[PDB]
Amino acid sequence: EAVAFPQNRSCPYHPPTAYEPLREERPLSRVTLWNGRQVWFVTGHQAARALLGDQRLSTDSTREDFPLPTERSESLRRRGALLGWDDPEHNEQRRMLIPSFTLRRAESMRPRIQAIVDRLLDDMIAAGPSAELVGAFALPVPSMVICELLGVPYGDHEFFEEQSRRLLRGPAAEDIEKAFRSLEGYFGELIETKRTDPGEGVIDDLVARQREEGRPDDDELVQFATVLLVAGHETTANMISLATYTLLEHPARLAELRADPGLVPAAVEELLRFLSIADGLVRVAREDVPVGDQVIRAGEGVVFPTSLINRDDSVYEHPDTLDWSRSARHHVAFGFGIHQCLGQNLARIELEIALGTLLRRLPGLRLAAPADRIPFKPGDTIQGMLELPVTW
Numbered sequence: 001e002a003v004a005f006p007q008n009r010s011c012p013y014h015p016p017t018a019y020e021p022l023r024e025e026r027p028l029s030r031v032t033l034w035n036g037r038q039v040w041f042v043t044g045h046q047a048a049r050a051l052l053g054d055q056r057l058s059t060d061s062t063r064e065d066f067p068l069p070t071e072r073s074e075s076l077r078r079r080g081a082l083l084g085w086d087d088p089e090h091n092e093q094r095r096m097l098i099p100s101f102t103l104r105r106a107e108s109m110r111p112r113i114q115a116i117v118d119r120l121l122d123d124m125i126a127a128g129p130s131a132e133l134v135g136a137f138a139l140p141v142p143s144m145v146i147c148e149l150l151g152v153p154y155g156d157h158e159f160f161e162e163q164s165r166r167l168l169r170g171p172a173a174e175d176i177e178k179a180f181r182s183l184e185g186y187f188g189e190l191i192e193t194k195r196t197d198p199g200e201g202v203i204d205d206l207v208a209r210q211r212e213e214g215r216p217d218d219d220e221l222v223q224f225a226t227v228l229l230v231a232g233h234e235t236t237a238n239m240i241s242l243a244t245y246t247l248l249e250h251p252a253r254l255a256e257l258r259a260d261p262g263l264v265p266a267a268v269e270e271l272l273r274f275l276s277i278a279d280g281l282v283r284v285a286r287e288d289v290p291v292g293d294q295v296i297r298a299g300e301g302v303v304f305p306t307s308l309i310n311r312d313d314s315v316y317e318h319p320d321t322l323d324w325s326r327s328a329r330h331h332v333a334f335g336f337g338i339h340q341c342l343g344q345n346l347a348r349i350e351l352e353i354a355l356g357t358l359l360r361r362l363p364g365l366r367l368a369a370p371a372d373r374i375p376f377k378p379g380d381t382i383q384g385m386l387e388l389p390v391t392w
């Protein structure tokens with residue numbers, strides 16, 4: 001009768017079935033972790049937005065009291081740049097990157113994103129009448145965009161796409177570490193190069209702050225480049241793959257987007273909301289935080305089940321249904337407040353161009369395998385498809 005967290009989805013595009021009873025307990029419920037530790041489970045949309053702006057919640061997975069949802073994550077110590085930091089140190093870091101992630105900067109990259117998407121679909125269409133869309137499209141689009149974002153030179157695009165793929169797919173754990181060391185090593189060299197080279201992108205922008213205000217040291221700069229890739233790659237890739245699967249499993253919603261390409265921006269917001277692939281943001285209370293007449297005591301864990309929060313029926317009528325006309329505004333698929341996704345302006349435009357161009361170019365797109373033989377991620381990680389066999 002106590003509900004374990006995290007759990008696997010049964011259906012790639014719905015929250016795990018066991019959480020259903022807890023949806024009625026707003027704004028706070030509770031779940032049990034692998035070791036019997038109980039944590040708060042924020043089911044209320046308004047409560048979730050208020051808590052995610054609260055400086056008394058911490059992302060510091062270095063603390064002995066930080067809830068590690070799995071036994072496997074028990075090995076989490078170094079603090080990860082931006083997300084693994086509290087303010088003021090977190091804001092100091094974010095302030096240096098924010099100017100690279102304006103909506104104007106997002107908008108300026110449309111033609112570069114269009115060219116990446118067009119090149120990958122041209123290659124996929126030329127290669128044959130079927131594809132594994134995760135490897136052929138969903139995985140390389142976001143890593144190639146992050147190339148353009150960071151200012152990786154064209155000649156290095158292949159190496160970068162490959163090493164970023166090993167990072168996610170790494171046949172062996174040794175491939176994941178070699179890829180990581182290879183990219184950190186590579187970012188090191190590219191910073192020296194960009195000292196004695198021109199360059200547009202986040203890396204040149206941070207070489208500029210460095211000179212102009214001593215600001216990012218070279219090790220910090222490498223950490224920023226690494227987290228940007230890691231935060232930007234699988235999230236975007238999994239939205240492309242699971243959005244596609246989901247669209248193919250809802251023929252009448254897919255037909256409305258084919259009919260009216262103008263709906264695609266609204267559709268991307270509704271898919272972010274409905275899919276909520278960044279499921280289960282984790283905090284610990286540093287101090288007592290009240291919510292109504294309930295108190296989250298110092299040292300107690302707080303889990304934000306993105307997928308349920310984005311299906312709060314006091315905000316979204318018929319929340320478990322895909323609807324292109326119902327405002328998906330104020331969704332928390334990119335989080336909210338202190339740690340709200342830095343790359344969300346860019347992510348939205350990648351999704352709009354990737355899905356918009358796929359639909360335009362491949363009107364016959366359909367699953368090339370039965371939908372229940374297609375593997376998807378377990379409950380303890382970013383949700384999404386591991387493969388997506390398609391034909392057209």
Ligand code: HEM
Nearest residue numbers: 082083231232235236239278281334335339341342343347
């Ligand atoms: C569909 C794509 C994406 C989704 C669904 C997504 C989701 C999220 C979420 C939910 C958070 C908040 C995590 C928490 O509060 O615990 C986050 C943070 C972040 N995301 Fe994204 N994200 C996406 C794309 C990207 C991209 C493209 C970048 C590119 C650089 C990026 C960089 C970041 C960074 C740096 C943070 C930490 C911000 C901070 O600590 O202040 N993300 N993302």
Ligand SMILES: COc1ccc(Cc2nccc3cc(OC)c(OC)cc23)cc1OC
Nearest residue numbers: 080081082083227230231278279280381382
């Ligand atoms: C800056 O640090 C990061 C930022 C984002 C990510 C990717 C990510 N973003 C938001 C929510 C996430 C939520 C996740 O699990 C529920 C997850 O599993 C690997 C990755 C997530 C990884 C990061 O690396 C530690």
